[PDB]
Structure formats: structure tokens, C-alpha cells
RNA sequence: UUUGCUACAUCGAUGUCGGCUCUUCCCACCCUGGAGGUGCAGCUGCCUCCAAGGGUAGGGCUGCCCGCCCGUUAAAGGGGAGCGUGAGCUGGGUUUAGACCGUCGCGAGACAGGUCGGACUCUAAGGGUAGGGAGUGCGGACCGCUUGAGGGGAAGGAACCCC
RNA sequence: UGGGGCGGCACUCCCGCGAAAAGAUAACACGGGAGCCCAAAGGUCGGCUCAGGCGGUACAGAACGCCGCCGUAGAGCGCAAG
RNA sequence: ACCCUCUUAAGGUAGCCAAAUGCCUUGCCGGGUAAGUUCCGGCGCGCAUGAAUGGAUCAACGCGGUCCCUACUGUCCCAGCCUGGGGCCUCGUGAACGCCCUGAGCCGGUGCACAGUCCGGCAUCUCCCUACACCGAGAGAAGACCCCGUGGAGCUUCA
RNA sequence: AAGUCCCGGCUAAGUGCCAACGAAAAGGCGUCUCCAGCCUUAGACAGCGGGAAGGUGGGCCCAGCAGCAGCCAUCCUCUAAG
């Protein structure tokens, strides 16, 4: 389903697992890559500039592409540390009954319209929240800006890159 | 769905007790005063004393003492434009001002 | 080589692979596409929705399951074609939709086939019906190589080497990119083929089954190869 | 341009599928015209950009629409107009009353399942359109010859053959 | 009653949330319950301290009884939730 | 093919079939056509065939349903010419329906969401005759469809 | 009806001449502006002629890759030059 459906806030935070049966497993499983505790010079970060939600599909695709680019440059355990910070706590739900139960003269239309869970997302409730960062030495500062630019292309919210 | 209208409905947090007020009645010095007719009191429900306990709608209101029946007091309170008389045990009262 | 086999119905699918002359089933699953009678809506307009919607939901998982079992084989470049069969229009709806990956969809060999049965007996029926296609699909590099060899011979550019004595000279230098060996058990040709594989030279073994094999045997004695670079 | 969601308009009625007939429009370009790239030698291909002036046909099967197929073609593109058009036709489909079958129901009966039979009203106040006659104005009554603001056009399009 | 039908019961009653820190507040909104059980599981008076862990003891074992140390409740209070 | 058990007594025999009965479904193979979702033959995973609730079966008969061939043709390619009666022009007789109004050219909008009348434009000299029916959400009938009413009527039965 | 009103700037598309009413991610040093950091008369950037390199084209593997085909180090005849 198009991402414009689940990019905006519609309702409260829906996270309590004990009152929500049958939540699908998120696509993201590994949130920290590389060699943390390595000796690094630069600590550049990816910062959002709007409020919204990021589906767990967008969050996993932005991670595979960034890891492949950095691993393509020199190596994997070598001097880079890739970390994605936000976890998908919010649960997004769809009134799927328009598919099946909306055509049996079953509770069709908007009758009994509370939806069923379809996946998870990361609410971004503040302006300027950290989403990813990567740590490299001084010789790799350029291959690290490009990794974050390619990853920023697969995310719904407008972002920046900051160097420190 | 419409809400159940029990006696203690929608009181999950009004009838809380803070961590430093728990236990069987702590303050005895308030109970050593005998309210006379014409005094002003505040209806403050004590969640741990379950006898002579008023309704949620009167918590924090200011009443006037008009009499006594046994160990409990007759308190006249205003809700809107209506006068209402309650019989409250003194563990659910504090003096006003 | 590996050939993909798919049989799809309105509510049943079978996935298999053809490894040489062996047929192996990968997954058989049902879909629960109901009819008009266990319904339901008791309305003509919206009863036809379900029958045409979990029909599509079933086709979605057929495509998804095909992707999981066939994409690994493609990444090692081991599949050479995909044959799809089945009764009705189920095969047409699956092939012409977006439910197959473009890598898989590009390997589907036309045309689609009518198969009445499912399971392993159905898979063997699909192979029997497509024996004509697999005849053309089994020798392509050999047919391409002979045309390329014929082009180089006329140009007289020395890119093609022939003769048992001269081939052994080029084999030691690793200059023969591909060596076509006529099938002759117990002769020097078979022994030469076994040695040739040690130098990285791809070897194609052909016999009388190909009309071009007679041309190779009559002219070059059955031994002819293509050179990676000019030698003399 | 589908299918849903909503229930704003029409219940003292806006005739409800398909086809035929006739007109016009969109462009997201199938062919015809221009330019470029190519893993473009030539022939044939594939792709990108401009462009709606002209074209896009005949049949078998089904009530169809979609679709499959036959012989050709430069190509036999895709959509809108109250799913354009029943005071133009048709009446195969569909939704009355009659009847048969299967399943269901104690029954009367039901199906969204199949099948046979089943009505198509009207003399055009107004506008529009296609043509044909008089009047007043310019400009006192008449005969004759003209110009060329303006308006419309596709008046032509395409293919095959020779060198 | 997001047409009616089929379904469900949001048709009597109770808890949380919806509910926007007084009061009132809707949805075929979400998460659930009651239609009883007890002569004690009721009344009063007295004594005691619970779950869990640590050290020492034959059978003895994570979990029998005994001797000590800690333990704000992490137990129990008929049944949903507070 | 044989034996044991449960619903509830038994467990579809002879035959027939994708049937006027088969959902899937244009079932599969063959015939007929250049090309056959219909038709014929065969098969039998028979959703849901079957024995006076009558099964199989067609001699003769049918203003019954369907498919194919020959002959024949204006049904068509693709229309043309001719004839009788009307229409057209004139004399006599002499109605009916539409009608807030006479103020109704059209394009884009506004507005309960498709205006003759409102807004912005572009147009527009007056009258008469024949022909056409596209628009006036054209005329004709307190919608038969659908829902509601603590409205009916006829039928049924285990109300 | 009332300003072809005044000052500082921008836009070349008829963009625009829209309170409620009609456009996103991406690309543009097209042009206009503000912050960083780094080189500049001890001659910057761009350009132009030359030196534009030598033991050695060292090499392992190789008929040969004589940087750049499969792993890789790393030494001065030197000074206005590598």
C-alpha cells in the first residue's frame, strides 16, 4: 500500500502488546553494524526535519543500502560503525475488511471499522531527531556522506547530514 | 459503548493515594476538633476509610455544617443551583481556610 | 542445468525443479477459493467480488512462493528456463501480472501448457509435453560457437585452432577459450578433452546428434577450438 | 477511463445492458512526419524527445464487454461526451405474470443456479440545425459589374512498382 | 442497524480506556466481566507476619522439619478490572 | 473386492450423463469450419443423475427448442430506377397534449454539487415556408423496484 | 468610486495578477544573498612551453600485462625539479 497512507499521524500511539493480538514481526532485526569501540575521528549523523512516521519497510531498506555501500568501499569489521537508533514501537492497522468482509454483505462499508494490525512504524514526535549515524576515520569522511545520502532517498521524511 | 455508572466509576486516579500517605488513618489531630454549626469544611474523600464515604462528584467542594447525627455530620453543599445535604464521617472532612 | 516447473490451478499449485532427468517437488499448497453456494452475501454484485478477490490473493502467494524457490537458483545462474502449465486461465493470469519477479518472468519459455493433474504425476506430464522446446534449449552455446567459429575461419585471422598436435601446443599456454571435442570413446579426442579442462578451457562434447558434428569430424578430424589470443 | 467508500440531488419517474447509425473531442503516440542514442556494418531491431494534420479495415466463436482464433495490413493505439445518441431503430441480455429440472424447505415456497415462452406509446408551442422566399437600414426609383475585413476546409492521405 | 437482510448485541448491570488534570459527554469504538458462591469465606477478641533469597543441619533433593540473617509487600484478601 | 463401527433403518442396483440437471467451466480428446464459449460423439474427479417420487428408449405425429448441408435469393458488399396511396400547393369541414413567464444564442463557472433567467465573456437586423428531430434533466401516469407504517389481502403450517 | 503613488531589491517564465482556492520527492553555481573552512604580491586559481623522468621496463606469477591481469612492499645521482 502506498506510503502516503501511513506517513501522517492518525490517532494516538498504539504500542501496548498485551492488548493487541497478532502483530507481525518487523523487517529490521539488526540495528548495530560494524566495529563499535573502534578508534574513529568523525561522528556524522542523519537528522530529520519534520514530524511523521517511518514504516519498518522503509527502515530496513535504508539500512541494507547503506551497509552495502560502506562494505563495498573497504571492508565490514573495519573502521566504520553503522547504527540505526529508532525502534518501530507503533503498530499500524488497516481496515482490511474492505477486501474480504466488505463484500459478503458482512460488516461492509464503514460498519465495524476498527482495523487489524499490518505492521509497525517509528513515530517521530520531535523536530530534529537522530535516525542514523556512522563513525569513521578521517580518510573515509567522503564515502560516509554518500552512504547517508543514498539511505536518505528511501525514507519518507526530509533529512539533513551533520558532521562532528 | 456507554459507560457503567457504578458508585466508584471513573475513579482510578481520584481515589489514588500517594506513596507517603498510605496506611490506616495517619492524621489524628484533625479528628480532635468537633465542628459546630456554621463552620466551613472541605469534602476530601479518604480512599482507605470505606465507611461514610461521599461520591466522586463532591470531592473538593466546600460545605457548611448544619447538624450532627451520631458520629457523622450533616453538611450542606451547592452543586449547581441546588442545595444538597450530605452525612459525612469526619475522616472525610478538613476545615476550610 | 535446472528447469523450473510450475503447475497452477484456481485453488492448487505445485512447484518443482527438473535436474537432468529427475523431478523434485518443492511445495504443494491449497488456497481455499470458495464458490457461489457457500456464500454468503446473497447479492450478485458483491459475491463476485470475493470469488475474484481471494482468487487474486491465492495468486499472490503462488508468485511469492515461486520467487523464494527460484531466485536462489538464478543468482548462481543455474536455471535455463521456466515452464508453466495448468488448466484454465490460471496460468495466463499469473504470467501476465506483476506477481512474478522480472528475473523469473524473463526465463519463462513460451507457450503455456494445458496439464490436467497436479502433483508429481502432473509435473511429469508437463515435461513430456515440452520435449520439443527442451530440444532447442539444450544446445545453444554449441550452435552459437559454430557460427562464431565459421566467421573466424573465413576471415583467416588465426583465431581458431585445429589439429591434435597444434591444440596440445595451445592448451599448455592456456590460449584455447573453448574446445569442441567430438564424441569418440577410447580415442585421443576423449583423452584430450579430459586434459583440456585443467587449463580453464571450457569443453563441449558433441557427436552425431548434431549436423555440424559431421562437418567438424570430416574437416578437422573432430578437434577444433577457439583461441583467447593470437599465437603466431 | 475500473472496483469500492459516503448518502449531497432526483421516489405526484431524468426509460436501466449490448449492437447499429451519425457527430465531435483528449493524448499518456499504434502507423504516417522530424531529431538523436545503441552492445547501430547493411537489412531488421530496441530505446528517448517533438508532434493529435491524416489513418487505424474484413471475418469465425459468445446476447454480450473482455478474450481466443483466421486471412490480410503502413498500422489494423487507448480513452471521454448523463458508461454521447430508444420523442433514431433493434430487442439477443436483464427484472412481472405461464412452465420444466437440480438443490433446499413439514409446507406454502426459495435460488442468484440452468432452460422454453413473453407489449417498445406521442400530430414538435420554444431553441438548434439544413435549405428556400419577402421587408426595413446603408440610400431618392432602377439596370449592370466588382473588391475582399471576416468565416469554413483534410481536400487530400497512404502504399506498391520503375530506375 | 453507515439501505434492508444475514450476523452481532454496543437491548439490564459492573471495571479500565476513549475523556481534553472540576462536573457532563457519542461511536456496529478498544480490553473484559455479572445473572452467583459462602454457616463461614459472617461478628468480635487475642497472638503472629507474607512472596523470595542466604548460612548450618541423615535420609533432605530448587522445593518436608529444626537453628539463625535479610526482606515496603515483590504475598494474600471467593470470582473481571481498578 | 472383502470385514468391523456411528449417525438414523439401509448405504444408489439396472441404467443414464457435463443433460432443459456440472459450481469449478469455454472440463479433456475427436468431428464439422480458414477460423466453433453453440452443436454432435466419447469419457465419467456425478457441487447436487436414477427407477410409477418412474429409469432406459424415439417408430408415427408437432404453427415445440437446436445444429449442419444443398438450392435460392437486394439480407448484405452498395445502392439505383420505376409504380399505387399519402406528403407538397389550393377550396370546404374542423380537434387534442404540452403552457409560472415569453424573457429561452452559446461557452466556461456559481450554486443541494449539469442554469432560458445568476457571474465573466463571445455573439446577435426583422418576418415567412419546407425539412430534421439533438436540447428544453421534452409529453403522458400521487414509481410497480427498494425501505418505512405497532397499514392490508390471499395462501401455508410444527405460530 | 479612489494612486498609471514613493523608496530599497528580485523574476523573463505571461511565472504571476488566489485569505478560505490548484502540486510533492528530486535536479539546476540560472541568477540574487548572507556562515564556515582552505590557498593568495615570499606571485594563488586557470592556462601556456619545457623538465614532463631515471636502477628498472625492479619485481612474485608469466612467451609478456614493462603502475592499472591473481597479494604486496617501498629505497636516492637530488634541489630553483618529480
From Swiss-Prot, chain A:
NCBIfam families: PRK04199.1-1, PRK04199.1-4
Superkingdom to which the source organism belongs: Archaea
CDD domains with a match to the protein in the record: Ribosomal_L16_L10e
Keyword Ribonucleoprotein: yes
Natural source organism: Sulfolobus acidocaldarius (strain ATCC 33909 / DSM 639 / JCM 8929 / NBRC 15157 / NCIMB 11770)
GO MF assignments: structural constituent of ribosome
GO biological process, one term: translation
InterPro entries xref list: Ribosomal_uL16, Ribosomal_uL16_arc, Ribosomal_uL16_CS_euk_arc, Ribosomal_uL16_dom, Ribosomal_uL16_euk_arch, Ribosomal_uL16_sf
GO CC terms in record: ribonucleoprotein complex; ribosome
Similarity section: Belongs to the universal ribosomal protein uL16 family.
Record-linked Gene3D superfamilies: Ribosomal protein L10e/L16
Designated name of the protein: Large ribosomal subunit protein uL16
Keywords of this entry: Ribonucleoprotein, Ribosomal protein
Pfam family name, one: Ribosomal_L16
UniProtKB/Swiss-Prot annotation, chain B:
Protein name: Large ribosomal subunit protein eL21
Record key words, sorted: Ribonucleoprotein, Ribosomal protein
Homology family: Belongs to the eukaryotic ribosomal protein eL21 family.
Biological process terms in GO annotation: translation
Gene3D superfamilies for this protein: Ribosomal protein L21
InterPro entries, sorted: Ribosomal_eL21 (IPR001147), Ribosomal_eL21_arc (IPR022856), Ribosomal_eL21_CS (IPR018259), Ribosomal_eL21_sf (IPR036948), Translation_prot_SH3-like_sf (IPR008991)
Any single Gene Ontology cellular-component annotation: ribosome
MF annotations from Gene Ontology: structural constituent of ribosome
Family matches, as PROSITE patterns: RIBOSOMAL_L21E
Gene (UniProt): rpl21e
Pfam family, one: Ribosomal_L21e
Lineage, uppermost ranks: Archaea, Thermoproteota, Thermoprotei, Sulfolobales, Sulfolobaceae
Signal peptide from the UniProt entry: none
Amino acid at each position: 500500500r502506498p506510503g502516503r497512507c501511513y506517513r501522517k499521524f492518525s490517532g494516538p500511539a498504539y504500542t501496548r502488546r498485551e492488548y493487541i493480538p497478532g502483530i507481525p514481526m518487523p523487517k529490521i532485526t539488526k540495528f548495530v553494524m560494524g566495529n563499535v569501540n573502534g578508534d574513529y575521528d568523525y561522528e556524522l549523523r542523519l537528522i530529520t526535519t519534520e514530524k511523521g512516521q517511518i514504516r519498518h519497510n522503509a527502515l530496513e531498506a535504508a539500512r541494507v543500502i547503506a551497509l552495502k555501500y560502506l562494505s563495498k568501499k573497504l571492508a565490514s569489521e573495519q573502521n566504520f560503525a553503522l547504527v540505526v537508533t529508532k525502534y518501530p514501537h507503533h503498530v499500524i492497522r488497516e481496515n482490511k475488511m474492505m477486501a474480504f468482509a466488505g463484500a459478503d454483505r458482512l460488516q461492509d462499508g464503514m460498519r465495524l471499522s476498527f482495523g487489524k494490525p499490518i505492521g509497525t512504524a517509528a513515530r517521530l514526535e520531535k523536530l530534529g531527531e537522530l535516525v542514523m549515524y556512522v563513525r569513521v576515520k578521517k580518510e573515509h569522511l567522503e564515502a560516509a556522506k554518500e552512504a547517508l545520502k543514498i539511505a536518505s532517498s528511501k525514507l519518507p521524511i526530509r533529512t539533513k547530514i551533520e558532521i562532528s | 459503548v456507554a459507560r457503567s455508572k457504578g458508585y466508584r466509576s471513573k475513579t482510578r486516579k481520584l481515589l489514588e493515594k500517594k506513596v507517603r500517605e498510605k496506611g490506616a488513618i495517619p492524621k489524628l489531630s484533625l479528628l480532635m476538633h468537633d465542628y459546630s454549626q456554621g463552620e466551613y469544611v472541605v469534602v476530601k474523600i479518604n480512599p482507605s476509610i470505606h465507611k461514610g464515604m461521599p461520591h466522586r462528584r463532591y470531592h473538593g467542594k466546600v460545605g457548611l455544617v448544619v447538624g450532627k447525627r451520631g458520629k457523622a455530620y450533616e453538611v450542606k453543599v451547592n452543586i449547581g443551583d441546588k442545595e444538597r445535604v450530605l452525612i459525612v464521617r469526619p475522616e472525610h472532612l478538613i476545615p476550610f481556610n | 542445468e535446472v528447469f523450473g516447473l510450475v503447475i497452477v490451478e484456481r485453488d492448487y499449485a505445485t512447484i518443482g525443479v527438473l535436474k537432468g532427468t529427475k523431478v523434485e517437488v518443492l511445495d504443494e499448497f491449497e488456497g481455499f477459493v470458495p464458490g457461489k453456494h457457500m456464500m454468503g452475501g446473497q447479492s450478485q454484485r458483491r459475491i463476485e467480488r470475493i470469488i475474484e478477490e481471494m482468487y487474486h490473493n491465492f495468486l499472490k502467494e503462488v508468485g511469492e512462493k515461486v520467487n523464494q524457490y527460484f531466485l536462489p537458483y538464478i543468482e548462481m545462474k543455474k536455471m535455463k528456463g521456466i515452464l508453466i502449465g495448468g488448466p484454465g486461465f490460471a496460468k495466463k493470469d499469473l504470467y501476465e501480472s506483476d506477481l512474478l519477479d522480472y528475473r523469473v518472468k524473463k526465463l519463462v519459455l513460451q507457450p503455456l501448457f494445458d496439464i490436467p493433474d497436479q502433483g508429481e504425476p502432473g509435473l511429469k506430464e508437463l515435461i513430456m509435453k515440452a520435449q520439443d522446446i527442451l530440444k532447442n534449449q539444450k544446445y545453444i552455446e554449441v550452435e552459437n560457437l559454430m557460427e562464431e567459429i565459421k566467421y573466424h575461419l573465413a576471415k583467416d585471422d588465426g583465431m581458431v585452432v585445429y589439429g591434435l598436435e597444434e591444440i596440445r601446443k595451445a592448451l599448455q599456454l592456456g590460449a584455447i577459450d573453448a574446445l569442441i571435442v567430438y564424441e569418440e570413446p577410447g580415442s585421443e579426442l576423449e583423452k584430450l578433452s579430459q586434459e583440456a579442462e585443467n587449463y580453464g578451457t571450457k569443453v563441449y562434447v558433441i557427436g552425431d546428434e548434431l549436423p555440424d558434428g559431421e562437418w567438424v569430424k570430416k574437416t578437422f578430424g573432430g578437434a577444433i577450438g577457439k583461441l583467447r589470443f593470437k599465437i603466431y
